[PDB]
Symmetry: D2
């Protein structure tokens, strides 16, 4: 699993569950091509988005539908989403965990890139 998304809820101190996540790869014409998507699990995790063969070097956008999440909880969100855009660079072997910590008017995102 070369790309994992973890989403947490800083309001309730919980995994952010059932959050729609879309992954896009930047196409040669500079447009975002849908690549993978899912909903975060009960652990606020989204596994199996892609495989190592599919996850080639490129620019990726991870779009987390944070707004729908906050709408489900009845809390007015600021952001339309959380958009995590990064270069997957092959180098040595790598696994990407895109973590998002969500608040209504704030999100933080971090990459954990490991061997």
């Amino acid at each position: 699993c070369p790309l994992m998304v973890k989403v947490l809820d800083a309001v309730r101190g919980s995994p952010a569950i059932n959050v729609a996540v879309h992954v896009f790869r930047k196409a040669a014409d500079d447009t975002w091509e849908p690549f993978a998507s899912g909903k975060t699990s009960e652990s606020g995790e989204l596994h199996g988005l892609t495989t190592e063969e599919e996850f080639v070097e490129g620019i990726y956008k991870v779009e987390i539908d944070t707004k729908s999440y906050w709408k489900a909880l009845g809390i007015s969100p600021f952001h339309e989403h959380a958009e995590v855009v990064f270069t997957a660079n092959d180098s040595g072997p790598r696994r990407y965990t895109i973590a998002a910590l969500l608040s209504p008017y704030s999100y933080s995102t971090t990459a954990v890139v490991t061997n």
Copy 2:
């Protein structure tokens, strides 16, 4: 000054200076139309992006060029940018302070929204 961007460097504990910031507004055809852009000052602040008149309702995207920032400091960062997308002025005009806190492999973005 209804839209301000404040960028901080979490490695140096300083304002993130001369960070390029691009603001786009979602057009009727769902494309991102260039709305405004600028550089953060020495205080890591970007003022005068827009006006009360120009800053109408819409979905705005603030794209903060964090990559070029980190690269100029000799760091290869993870993200291409910090990018804040939001509906502005849905309940009437508000003042928006978009703050980004930057680390090479992480950023947070927060909004202070106030009613003038």
Copy 3:
């Protein structure tokens, strides 16, 4: 004004107003001696905690009463406080902006340190 505290509410996208902030300085006997305290203003800022003369080298602890803040807003928060401990003025006097961003179950604390 060598020490400023800025508290933001990440739920409301607003300054965190009337947040009690206690500053302690580590004494020679390793105890935390009360150094200064105050409330954040309407802008979520706390100015005038100390002076250049008073704010000597040391290890300082800034304790932000986030719990009472969230409780007054009807939220039972996780943390008792946001609490920033740091060595101040080791390389000579600096200006410190301690910023805290608050969510009921999370906070970030950042320092902007500048040379006057």
Copy 4:
């Protein structure tokens, strides 16, 4: 495992490995009593700090030696540490993950409290 500490490095995008973590419980005389400690693993995780029998309701301080971590990497840190102070409240069953995201001049901490 009723209390888990996870520490990440926002500079290198990695688990924060070998970070000393001390857990304290507030004693009746209002002093911090050492309760548990460890060093974060290769996954930046600290498991087995306590047991459900030991982890009674109370006020806990999780102190993360962030400064030593940054000193090891040769990066000048702002904070002496990251001090996470919270009330463990029994309620229904609970597991506490104290996560810290570390930058030299910034730390964020989040609680993930689950069943």
